[PDB]
Amino acid sequence: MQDAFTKAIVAADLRGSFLSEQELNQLTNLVKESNKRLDAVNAITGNAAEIISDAAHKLFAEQTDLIRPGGNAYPNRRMAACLRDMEIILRYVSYALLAGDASVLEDRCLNGLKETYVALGTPTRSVARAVQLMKETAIGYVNSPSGVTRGDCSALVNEAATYFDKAAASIA
Amino acid sequence: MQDAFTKAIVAADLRGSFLSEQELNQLTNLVKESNKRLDAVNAITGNAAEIISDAAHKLFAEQTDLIRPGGNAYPNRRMAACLRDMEIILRYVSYALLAGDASVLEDRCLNGLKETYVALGTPTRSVARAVQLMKETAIGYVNSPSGVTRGDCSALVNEAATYFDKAAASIA
Amino acid sequence: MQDAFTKAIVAADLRGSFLSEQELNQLTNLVKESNKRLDAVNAITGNAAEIISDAAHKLFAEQTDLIRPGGNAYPNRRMAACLRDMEIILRYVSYALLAGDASVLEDRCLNGLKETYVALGTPTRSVARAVQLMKETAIGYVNSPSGVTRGDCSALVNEAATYFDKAAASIA
Amino acid sequence: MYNNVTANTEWGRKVFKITVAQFPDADGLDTDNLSQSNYFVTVPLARLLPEMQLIKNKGGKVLSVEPVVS
Amino acid sequence: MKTVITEVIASADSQGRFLNNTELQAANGRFQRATASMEAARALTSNADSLVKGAVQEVYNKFPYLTQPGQMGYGDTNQAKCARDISHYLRFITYSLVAGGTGPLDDYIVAGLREVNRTFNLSPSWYIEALKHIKGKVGSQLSGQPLTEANAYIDYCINALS
Amino acid sequence: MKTVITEVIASADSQGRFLNNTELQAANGRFQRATASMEAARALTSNADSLVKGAVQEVYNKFPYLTQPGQMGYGDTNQAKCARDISHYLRFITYSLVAGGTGPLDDYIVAGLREVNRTFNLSPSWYIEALKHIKGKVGSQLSGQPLTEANAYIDYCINALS
Amino acid sequence: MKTVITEVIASADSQGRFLNNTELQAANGRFQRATASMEAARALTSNADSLVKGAVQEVYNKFPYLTQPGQMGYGDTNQAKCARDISHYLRFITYSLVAGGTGPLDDYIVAGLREVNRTFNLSPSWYIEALKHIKGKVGSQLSGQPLTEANAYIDYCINALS
Amino acid sequence: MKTVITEVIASADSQGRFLNNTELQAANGRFQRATASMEAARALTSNADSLVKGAVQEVYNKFPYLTQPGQMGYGDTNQAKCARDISHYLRFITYSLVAGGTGPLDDYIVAGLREVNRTFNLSPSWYIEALKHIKGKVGSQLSGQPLTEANAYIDYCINALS
Amino acid sequence: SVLTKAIVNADAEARYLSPGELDRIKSFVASGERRLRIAQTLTEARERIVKQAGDQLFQIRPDVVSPGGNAYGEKMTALCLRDLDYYLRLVTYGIVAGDVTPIEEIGIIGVKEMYNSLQTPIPAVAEGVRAMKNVATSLLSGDDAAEAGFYFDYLVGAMQ
Amino acid sequence: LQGVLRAVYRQVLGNTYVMESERPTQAESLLRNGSISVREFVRRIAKSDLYKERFFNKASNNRFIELNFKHLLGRAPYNHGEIQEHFGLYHKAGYDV
Amino acid sequence: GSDTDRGKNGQRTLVTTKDLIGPTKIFVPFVAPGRDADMVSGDY
């Protein structure tokens, strides 16, 4: 598994080199913003259930076919599987966010996922949408939390978004 | 698993026949040369480590890219993986040599091996070469050993070579 | 598994109570001395091999019967087992030292150990001695290390000793 | 001793000891490699009910339970 | 019992390995963090009495019907066992604060929660609402990293119940 | 690749669990520790050239016979491959410093070490003595927690080789 | 296919190990033994025709009733398939003699024997009696270690059928 | 303890099977081979004293520096423990010769070898050079199949140490 | 473009560009800014152009917008002007490319089969395009109006 | 015991190789003691980081569940119900259960 | 062969859940990206 430092190290090694002063300071900056990062990961963990629930309510509000017989979130067994997948993806997105690298998300979650869903008959476009809704709400929470010091988290909100967007793209 | 006798038996059975006087004497000759065969297998066993080591030293002497970063025998684990594969192949070649048949080599070692290496990014041409070097040194030992009775081992040296050459061909 | 805090918590809970101001400050002090504790655990980790080696050299210097045929550290297989056990015990002592509680040592290492050795015919008094020697050298290292800030580590040296002494007592 | 490192919860830390005597069930001759039917397993507290369930499920007889960790 | 210390030790042990710089760095986090944690712990400890009575009442104010006869917020024994239960939660929150991890919560409240609540006809909604209220008031007893810690664990209980 | 960050994530994943306060406390350790680590890294990085030549020579001064003909410290190629190898070690030490764990050392030097050294007739003693020397000189390039970090990883290599 | 050679190779392979003096000593046994084995093989090979007709008849002489109508020793096809079957056994005996082990017998006659015989209403007793007779006559075609070898394998078939 | 006899018995037992012609052929190899083996054993046994002193010295002649002060070939105790160790090797070689397999070597010297040598700072190179020398001199004490046997086991030790 | 066309002929005969081919690339690129201005003007008046084409069309063929007409009704007429908007767009592309490659792959190859299926009268689509020429051409200088006009007459030609 | 350990490392770890540093040594001192059986030793390996890093840490749940069937049970997945049962257990109770 | 990850595709899936459930029978989501709207009145 990689994190943002480990990634630097792998690229340096492929040159046969000690880390460039370029790369050093990029990593010094990651340490600089790490308290914000911890709050951002904490924002997701602290509202995981609601993020999934709210995404869910809204997914089925839009796509009332999934909860009809014939639909891929019917009966209870399938809805529980769908709720479970929402949690799994939100989980690996939070891991990537602590790590500063998408690899755990791509390697443990996204790799093969689309082909799984197609084999199953699970409508990937609906799954992509559920991921887009989780993103909206998750970032909502990253941006408006309990008595965190006031500052600018937009860099981290972007990065979190790209992890949500990776997952969506990979699946649709 | 087959040996040279077992092979005879399978071909006889496919005719529905007791072994031909042809096949009988071919096998009587294998028994005739079996002390030499035991010395030949013993030559390899008794120098396995040096055969691998010497092949290795020479492989990396020729192909200094493998031991640079980016190279398939770098860092220490990859080199350790490359050093037994050398051992594994030398091992199945010695088994074939005791058996008088290549099947154990083809079935337990060579089958799928090329596609493994390609999946891994292991340069098959380099692996083929490492096998060619093991052959040179192994045969060296088969031909010039400790106080073995003097005679002609060229038939066995050829046969050992074909096992080394099978492996090389199969992999490159 | 317990650490020094977890232990406090279990005793509090058995009263049905929030932690006593008594217990709170005992734990505040553990946090106060924690940098020293980290150096103490680091002293052992950084010299584990030598601690085992030096204990060993000295154990067999004293008890030359163990390395004779008939002796419990003869032949190579048994010596490797004995060297391995020295490492295992030093390892759980270092864990206890990071934790501020002996429980991991007692539960994962010492529990049943004496009866194992007796079943095996392993002389427990010799094992106890090997533990006493590890203690001497380990503490040596805790007390005289590389450019650590000067201060008083005797409280921690005592506590480390009691873990070594627990193990010795439990085994002899 | 036992299996050693367990789960990190306190309810995984407690390992117990079971001496059994498995019986030949019914229905079939075992011609494979057989073992003497006594034995003992050390099982952590978190697992225990599946293990005792499959022990008494296969005609077994639990002879002793022992508190070895706790 | 899950703490930063027990976790790194567990991970070392399971690989048959001495604690190394990775594991000691981790431990320093837990020790550096103790001050904020333990401030939250002391504030939650001395306000316990009122935090509990505040949350108990709020369960009845949000679920008015509970306090009518034939219901589970009626009579001394239900209302007594309620205060006790919220008190258990606050107690384990302080323990988790002091311990440096969720262990006390995981072992004494989370493991088994739903089975128990389901057999006894206890709705999680009450408990979430008790905790949401406790979270509101703890906003003005603490601030900075002690508040973040208090929040971390209160929210952890709310997610355990959803 | 073992870092504090990857370790806590691995432990969460394997229990199917979001990162909680236990795991985030751990991460803070790794981030709080980065300054000392990275100071050690910068000092080891710019002195690399001389640290390597110093240790290479010390291998010959401690094992004089290595530099005689027919031996493995003789001729341009042996002496070249030696400098390179110590340079590999210092490189991975800096990586381990920057990464917040032993991962780079574990994955690129420790995994396989003995098999390789045994096939190639390389004695660990040389490498320990190279590292003991590097440890002596790093005593005056750094101090405080940067030195402790440098030491942690140098010692880690010496234990890997014993 | 089980021979001394395949057995020792199997045992080496499964421990990831080169053939050593233990395994080569074993192989020498198999090679030293080939002369007696192969003499038995040649004698059984050229007498096959009559050994088969002798044993076939003996099955009818020992189980007279088999040759009456409505029975399984009656008509050209039963009596033909019988000769064939004994011929199969003698064939695999010669193969086992030549191969240096029971492999050919194990793989081509023993594996599955009872299931087949049970579905087709073939009594092992016949086959044992065919083999007992073949054993009687092979007493005067061979002697010494060739006879011991012939016996070893005939008896092996009789035990497979009991 | 690995011998031809124990190996074939192990293989039978593990398939729940009586010893058959395959396994008895194997055993005959081990018994036929005993004469050469045991001649090697007797020669190595009576020359033990000098074979050991010859190899001990050769370790110092090939690694001159070992015999200087502060080194591991200096003082009565090192030089005593060395003779002993080579004597252990020759002893197990004779045992392996007599036993008909590598068992005694595998169980008493190979299992654990590297761990022990690594903890005690014993270089395999010495031991290989002791054995290479013993191999040189055993060239004129034996010949034919006794020499081949002696060689088989000496070489087996040298490969165990590489 | 002019580039694509020149090159494809070059590569297909396994050769470097001719003096002729080089010359036309040069004359073409010199007209770049002018061609870009012609596209801008027309892009800037697109909504007006489509409309005046649409009036000119329904006078000339009131039937298409009649009981049995392909464009009869408010939303059968809405789609019809949208198609007129499509073709004006393609005409701006063609003018800036200096040939039809893009215009052709996007909107004439397959157009017979598409409209035959929909039962759209092709020759009245050609009229809608003439109508757009008339409007667009009245918003351009004489020289630019001619240059634009070639591309309008091409589309009119291809629907044939 | 070495022959048993080699077969365990061949089967459970899926013919991938363990280096000399990766060897779980202190479980073997006990398996040689006889305090655990082969089944408990297999369970201890499959919960360790050797199995976890290779077959769990970089794959999806389908690959991981089908690799459990190959390593531990020695056979292939039979239907979709075997996979949809096991992953529900993984999400409910983690990797250790 | 082995189930190693160190190749170019570290543990891509095999026996895909297109194997485990076999044939399909009926459905595609019959969705409407066809459009609807505008309203004028008269003359027809």
Ligand SMILES: CCC1=C(C)/C(=C/C2=NC(=C\c3[nH]c(/C=C4\NC(=O)[C@H](C)[C@H]4CC)c(C)c3CCC(=O)O)/C(CCC(=O)O)=C2C)NC1=O
């Ligand atoms: C237990 C693990 C852990 C956490 C969670 C942690 C958080 C943490 N967040 C901090 C700051 C902060 N955190 C934020 C975060 C935000 N600002 C906003 O306006 C957004 C809504 C939000 C975006 C994510 C900001 C702006 C600061 C102050 C600037 C800084 O220190 O970087 C600080 C510095 C002290 C302070 O200023 O309060 C800490 C210690 N420390 C830890 O050890």
Ligand SMILES: CCC1=C(C)/C(=C/C2=NC(=C\c3[nH]c(/C=C4\NC(=O)[C@H](C)[C@H]4CC)c(C)c3CCC(=O)O)/C(CCC(=O)O)=C2C)NC1=O
């Ligand atoms: C422990 C297992 C085992 C071994 C290893 C074994 C070897 C062995 N090799 C032999 C002969 C021999 N071995 C060789 C071998 C060679 N000649 C050369 O010049 C080459 C360098 C080498 C080629 C491989 C030759 C030429 C003979 C004599 C001819 C013969 O007997 O076939 C003999 C017959 C006796 C003798 O003449 O010495 C034996 C018993 N016997 C055994 O039971």
Ligand SMILES: CCC1=C(C)/C(=C/C2=NC(=C\c3[nH]c(/C=C4\NC(=O)[C@H](C)[C@H]4CC)c(C)c3CCC(=O)O)/C(CCC(=O)O)=C2C)NC1=O
């Ligand atoms: C990577 C994990 C980690 C470690 C190892 C760590 C060590 C560490 N040890 C420290 C202090 C110290 N460490 C010691 C230790 C000793 N004094 C002696 O004389 C004895 C020989 C030795 C006994 C163990 C002392 C006396 C201090 C200064 C007092 C204190 O800060 O408590 C400090 C405070 C800064 C300083 O004064 O240097 C740190 C950060 N911090 C970490 O995050």
Ligand SMILES: CCC1=C(C)/C(=C/C2=NC(=C\c3[nH]c(/C=C4\NC(=O)[C@H](C)[C@H]4CC)c(C)c3CCC(=O)O)/C(CCC(=O)O)=C2C)NC1=O
């Ligand atoms: C290590 C090699 C080995 C041995 C020796 C062995 C003995 C053994 N015999 C058993 C049963 C048995 N053994 C017998 C034997 C006899 N009954 C009589 O009346 C006679 C006196 C005698 C035959 C001469 C019977 C009847 C049982 C079944 C008992 C029962 O289930 O009621 C069982 C219980 C498991 C089972 O039924 O398969 C074992 C373990 N198991 C082994 O693995």
Ligand SMILES: CCC1=C(C)/C(=C/C2=NC(=C\c3[nH]c(/C=C4\NC(=O)[C@H](C)[C@H]4CC)c(C)c3CCC(=O)O)/C(CCC(=O)O)=C2C)NC1=O
């Ligand atoms: C160590 C941690 C721990 C927890 C958290 C815990 C919860 C818990 N609550 C219980 C009962 C109860 N819990 C309540 C709760 C409430 N009643 C109200 O007025 C409110 C609606 C609400 C408070 C918000 C009630 C009324 C009962 C009695 C249920 C019964 O027995 O009918 C019981 C059943 C045993 C008993 O009757 O005491 C348990 C185990 N037990 C524990 O050991």
Ligand SMILES: CCC1=C(C)/C(=C/C2=NC(=C\c3[nH]c(/C=C4\NC(=O)[C@H](C)[C@H]4CC)c(C)c3CCC(=O)O)/C(CCC(=O)O)=C2C)NC1=O
């Ligand atoms: C990524 C981490 C990594 C390490 C650590 C590494 C070590 C390493 N050292 C090697 C060789 C070598 N290493 C040395 C070492 C020395 N010679 C001397 O003068 C001194 C005594 C000593 C330095 C202290 C020598 C002489 C060789 C050549 C060995 C040979 O091929 O004969 C080789 C064999 C391939 C080659 O010839 O380059 C490896 C793999 N390789 C790696 O990829």
Ligand SMILES: CCC1=C(C)/C(=C/C2=NC(=C\c3[nH]c(/C=C4\NC(=O)[C@H](C)[C@H]4CC)c(C)c3CCC(=O)O)/C(CCC(=O)O)=C2C)NC1=O
């Ligand atoms: C490769 C080794 C091999 C063996 C040993 C073998 C046995 C064998 N015997 C068979 C039948 C038979 N076997 C016999 C045997 C006999 N009839 C007599 O007159 C005597 C009593 C007796 C000879 C002693 C008979 C009568 C049948 C025909 C059974 C039937 O189809 O009804 C069949 C059924 C297929 C068939 O009808 O040919 C098998 C497979 N097949 C094999 O492939």
Ligand SMILES: CCC1=C(C)/C(=C/C2=NC(=C\c3[nH]c(/C=C4\NC(=O)[C@H](C)[C@H]4CC)c(C)c3CCC(=O)O)/C(CCC(=O)O)=C2C)NC1=O
């Ligand atoms: C049953 C088979 C068996 C073997 C093979 C064996 C080897 C062995 N050699 C040892 C020590 C030793 N081995 C030597 C070896 C040598 N010193 C020299 O002068 C030479 C360089 C060299 C001989 C070639 C030395 C000097 C020691 C003492 C190491 C120490 O304790 O510092 C020890 C440590 C216990 C002790 O001090 O006796 C073992 C176990 N032990 C066994 O039980």
Ligand SMILES: CCC1=C(C)/C(=C/C2=NC(=C\c3[nH]c(/C=C4\NC(=O)[C@H](C)[C@H]4CC)c(C)c3CCC(=O)O)/C(CCC(=O)O)=C2C)NC1=O
């Ligand atoms: C749970 C962690 C754990 C511990 C603590 C452990 C102890 C342990 N020590 C053992 C052997 C051993 N232990 C020793 C230790 C010693 N010999 C001496 O003379 C000294 C007094 C002492 C060293 C200080 C020796 C020599 C053996 C081998 C005994 C033999 O096989 O003859 C064995 C038998 C299995 C084996 O040899 O690998 C176990 C299980 N095993 C474990 O898994």
Ligand SMILES: CCC1=C(C)/C(=C/C2=NC(=C\c3[nH]c(/C=C4\NC(=O)[C@H](C)[C@H]4CC)c(C)c3CCC(=O)O)/C(CCC(=O)O)=C2C)NC1=O
């Ligand atoms: C590596 C981490 C990981 C992921 C991501 C994962 C996905 C995954 N989702 C599955 C099923 C499923 N996934 C869903 C999900 C949905 N249904 C819908 O209609 C929505 C569009 C969507 C929810 C947003 C459903 C309904 C099933 C059950 C399909 C069935 O059995 O018919 C399955 C089949 C096994 C099972 O049912 O447990 C896998 C492997 N498995 C994993 O181990």
